[PDB]
Amino acid sequence: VSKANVPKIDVSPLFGDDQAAKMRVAQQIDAASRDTGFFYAVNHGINVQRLSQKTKEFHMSITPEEKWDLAIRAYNKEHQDQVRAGYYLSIPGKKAVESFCYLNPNFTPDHPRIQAKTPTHEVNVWPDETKHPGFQDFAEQYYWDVFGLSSALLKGYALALGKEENFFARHFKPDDTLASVVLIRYPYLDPYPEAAIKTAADGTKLSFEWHEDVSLITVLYQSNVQNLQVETAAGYQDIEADDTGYLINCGSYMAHLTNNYYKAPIQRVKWVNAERQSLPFFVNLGYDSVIDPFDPREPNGKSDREPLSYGDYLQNGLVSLINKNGQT
Ligand SMILES: CC(C)[C@@H](NC(=O)[C@H](CS)NC(=O)CCC[C@H](N)C(=O)O)C(=O)O
Ligand SMILES: [Fe+3]
């Protein structure tokens, strides 16, 4: 198995006012998006030093009682409103991974989308503060920290596609973004349940099968344990780990609106018997956000594809991923 070209791109110019420097970042994003589809954003300004420890301590300190109390609808029929946000329980002997997902902290009972019961909008559930001191504060701060990084990255993608730098970020707003964070724990298990291991067509043992991200872009931090693979025409290639950079790639919404110029890479997770943490931030727009498709491969830039409302796209994408790759 070969290794994917995943360049490290210094994205710090995307926070500044040096427009030519931003174009040089955009060029690198373009090249990476046209190659394997991945790059590492470095010099990003986020303090990732304790992210994995906090994630690990939370999952290892939360009790079965608390897990049920926070569980999403898939694990607790009492919580019919929790489709996205809440705890995703492991099933010992069957399912190793466990996780906790939260949404826009601004989704409160006062929010008109909560008032209207619009799909994909939910009020976050949180554990008891005294049992997990500082956890909710850390989590909400992280949401906005990575929101800021993602907003700059979207300026890079816009410039890379020949657009004004706010072409994407104008739709990415704190008051309505459907973006999510997931704090995922992959445990070390001895013995590891074979039932939790899937075998790929090529014989690779996997924890999670091939998929395309449901997002505009995905902004991912992982602990330093190699696991991800990207599919190329020559087969699946290992994505090396990087314990300070953020792994970036385009989701299927970007593939749609660019007429497949920036494809959504097919990715999978190799099975590794190791304690590790995976923290994706899914850059989602607002429920009614619509981006008009274009084709950067055409002189007139014209695409015949339908503009897609992002909320309906997200609703369809998340259900499809569950149906295909199972409930996480
Ligand atoms: C890096 C990825 C492969 C990561 N997995 C993931 O990101 C997984 C599987 S593709 N993502 C999802 O299932 C979509 C989560 C959407 C979230 N609940 C929401 O409501 O917005 C991992 O480490 O497992
Ligand atoms: Fe993915």
Swiss-Prot record:
PROSITE patterns registered for this protein in UniProt: FE2OG_OXY, IPNS_1, IPNS_2
Residues the record lists as binding Fe(2+): 211, 213, 267
GO molecular function annotation: iron ion binding; isopenicillin-N synthase activity; L-ascorbic acid binding
Residues of the site described as Transition state stabilizer: 208
Cofactor: Fe(2+)
Binding site for 2-oxoglutarate: 276
Effect on the protein upon substituting residue 280 to L: Abolishes the catalytic activity
InterPro entries on file: DIOX_N, IPNS-like_FE2OG_OXY, IPNS-like_sf, Isopenicillin-N_synth_CS, Oxoglu/Fe-dep_dioxygenase_dom
Coiled-coil stretches: none
Subcellular location: Cytoplasm, Cytosol
Record carries keyword DNA repair: no
Record-listed E.C. numbers: 1.21.3.1
Entry's Gene Ontology cellular component terms: cytosol
Quaternary state and interactors: Monomer.
Record PANTHER family: 2-OXOGLUTARATE (2OG) AND FE(II)-DEPENDENT OXYGENASE SUPERFAMILY PROTEIN, OXIDOREDUCTASE, 2OG-FE II OXYGENASE FAMILY PROTEIN
Function: Isopenicillin N synthase; part of the gene cluster that mediates the biosynthesis of penicillin, the world's most important antibiotic. IpnA catalyzes the cyclization of the tripeptide N-[(5S)-5-amino-5-carboxypentanoyl]-L-cysteinyl-D-valine (LLD-ACV or ACV) to form isopenicillin N (IPN) that contains the beta-lactam nucleus. The penicillin biosynthesis occurs via 3 enzymatic steps, the first corresponding to the production of the tripeptide N-[(5S)-5-amino-5-carboxypentanoyl]-L-cysteinyl-D-valine (LLD-ACV or ACV) by the NRPS acvA.
Protein name: Isopenicillin N synthase
Organism per entry: Emericella nidulans (strain FGSC A4 / ATCC 38163 / CBS 112.46 / NRRL 194 / M139)
Lineage per the UniProt record: Eukaryota, Fungi, Dikarya, Ascomycota, Pezizomycotina
